[PDB]
Design an enzyme around this catalytic site. Structure first.
Site, short mmCIF file in Angstrom:
data_model
loop_
_atom_site.label_atom_id
_atom_site.label_comp_id
_atom_site.label_asym_id
_atom_site.label_seq_id
_atom_site.Cartn_x
_atom_site.Cartn_y
_atom_site.Cartn_z
CE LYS A 117 0.44 -2.07 -7.86
NZ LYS A 117 -0.59 -2.23 -6.81
CB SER B 10 -5.43 -4.83 -0.41
OG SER B 10 -4.72 -3.58 -0.45
#
Ligand SMILES: Cc1ccc(C[C@@]2(C(=O)O)C[C@H]2c2ccccc2)cc1
Ligand SMILES: Cc1ccc(C[C@@]2(C(=O)O)C[C@H]2c2ccccc2)cc1
Ligand SMILES: *Cc1c(COP(=O)(O)O)cnc(C)c1O
Ligand SMILES: *Cc1c(COP(=O)(O)O)cnc(C)c1O
Ligand SMILES: [Co+2]
Lengths: 321, 318
Positions: B43, B274
């Site tokens: 991000k 993830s």
């Protein structure tokens, strides 16, 4: 640097960014973000190079297991490199080392041997020696405070990156000293290889454990406890070359903490306590007119994310806040 | 890349390493370590570019403040960029949010607005909309799930890095989908800009919320709760271009966690849940003869150090 597939995560060390501080100091502090490393600290470089060097020297080979006493970022670095390269690793440390660090080390596959908390790092060093003595052919101690492969990697990577990223314009180099490898190796590249003998090399240490100042003054070594994690081991390490140091700046626990908080809020650079200490030393030098127009490179060893359970994130915000 | 001084930390995004996995999979899984970023996640690229894009669009004039509802890595990304570039930032999130995470966001200068726990992410989205509506000239919502500056940064940085580092040899690209920006932007670069239409793009999602699989099959969208933080939002985001997906692989909670543990223990790559999910999907593809000789690039979005309070570190001791 050039585009490739790295053969393991140890080979990804370094090339850390040099970032201008725009709100802290006069605009000439350049922060080298050593948390941009495969296990997120400056130690990534030495975990890599001490193992690569042991390979090259023929002392680390199939069947040989690594041992090191460390309750800090060196243990994390050795753990990820041992995992990446397929070595077994045993780390010794006092049983007071945080659950966060134990979790990290076990996840990276390290074997942990917890020693009596009351005996601190001395007890962990004694246990590591005992383990190696139980089977010296099997076990290899890396000895981060004296192993020359520690400053060597800073001579070959960290220093060249500072010289190249500043296009030779660095004037001052500031390093908080733990093992001394970073200070020694970077200074050897800049003063030695590049011949810039008028670089000002600044060692940072805790006000409460000012042993480098004591050693340069020819005084008794008298350490003390302090909160600047990663620096101030309370002795002069083998990997600190006192002859390379131009100035020593002592930093208080509160100065280190407050300045680390400023790096985060004012610059968006996640920073550990020793990163605050090194930047606080740059701010003290900028009180002196001799430094007003000098470009100051400062090592930021670690990320504040690793410090959520420490003083850095305590006494900061109220329940209500 | 070129040696320089970065003028602020947002400009240091990217150039993350691509590492061959030697024990996990067949030696052709190439892991892109997106925790090698200024706030340690994928991000960081979109926190930087959504703010740079807002500057370029003229919508971040003096006095304008940022607002975003986020429980995750986007809040940390926007916080370090807002601190680096001198913006005020408000994040909304449910009160469930841990004190340690509030401390970290707080340390980066973010203003936190805690919303009712029972209302979850939906309540935080509602509160962000209400804050903007209270003074629309003052507040700018970034809207990470639909803002095209999200996939744009992956088209301009992540994608090129994969193409360069593999010398164009990438055959399969695997991304766990949260916003979809990574999948969309990388695939636009490689299939479109580089013209490699034979690339196999693989979306990864939780078996317990398999909405991408449902969408591609033309089945009704039916999400569910799962543990794979950062992926599987339970709807098809605006920033996920379904047209670009060749295959969807569903991964269990347990497969994600176990494979993340293998990345740490076997490869020395600190890795989030993830990251485990995406690599677990590569392993499934490598059971199919059609994939055996292929170079598989997999995004690892985060570092396991951000997960120390989670099941990722459970049962490591007795
Ligand atoms: C919590 C912590 C963090 C970093 C360190 C740095 C060192 C390590 O072994 O990782 C080098 C050693 C050290 C120990 C004591 C003072 C200074 C450096 C030690 C402990
Ligand atoms: C704990 C956590 C971690 C990562 C995220 C990723 C996202 C964020 O805002 O940081 C993108 C959003 C998200 C939310 C729910 C599912 C998938 C992605 C969210 C929550
Ligand atoms: C190791 C370390 C230092 C000191 O670096 P040396 O090269 O050992 O002098 C400073 N801070 C932290 C957090 C470290 O882990
Ligand atoms: C955002 C995120 C992802 C998904 O990436 P997108 O580009 O949003 O699809 C995966 N894992 C984590 C931990 C994330 O924060
Ligand atoms: Co480069």
């Amino acid at each position: 640097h050039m585009s490739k597939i790295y053969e393991d995560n140890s080979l990804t060390i370094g090339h850390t960014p040099l970032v201008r501080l725009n709100r802290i100091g006069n605009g000439r502090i350049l922060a080298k973000v050593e948390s941009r490393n495969p296990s997120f600290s400056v130690k990534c470089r030495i975990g890599a190079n001490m193992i690569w060097d042991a390979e090259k020297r023929g002392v680390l080979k199939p069947g040989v297991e690594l041992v090191e006493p460390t309750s800090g970022n060196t243990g994390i670095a050795l753990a990820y490199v041992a995992a990446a390269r397929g070595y077994k690793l045993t780390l010794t440390m006092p049983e007071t080392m945080s659950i966060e660090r134990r979790k990290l080390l076990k996840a990276l596959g390290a074997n942990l041997v917890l020693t009596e908390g009351a005996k601190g790092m001395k007890g962990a060093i004694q246990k590591a020696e005992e383990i190696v003595a139980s089977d010296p052919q099997k076990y290899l101690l890396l000895q981060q405070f004296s192993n020359p492969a520690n400053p060597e990697i800073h001579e070959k990577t960290t220093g060249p990156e500072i010289w190249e990223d500043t296009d030779g314009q660095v004037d001052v180099f500031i390093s908080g000293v733990g093992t001394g490898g970073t200070l020694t190796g970077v200074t050897r590249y800049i003063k030695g290889t590049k011949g810039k003998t008028d670089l000002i090399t600044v060692a940072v240490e805790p006000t409460d454990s000012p042993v480098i100042a004591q050693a340069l003054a020819g005084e008794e070594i008298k350490p003390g406890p302090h909160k600047i994690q990663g620096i101030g081991a309370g002795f002069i390490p083998g990997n600190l070359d006192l002859k390379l140091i131009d100035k020593v700046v002592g930093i208080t626990n509160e100065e280190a903490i407050s300045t680390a908080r400023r790096l985060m809020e004012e610059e968006g650079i996640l920073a550990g306590i020793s990163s605050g200490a090194a930047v606080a030393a740059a701010l003290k030098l900028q009180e002196d007119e001799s430094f007003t127009n000098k470009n100051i490179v400062v090592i930021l060893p670690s990320s504040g994310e690793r410090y959520l359970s420490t003083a850095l994130f305590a006494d900061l915000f109220t329940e209500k806040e």
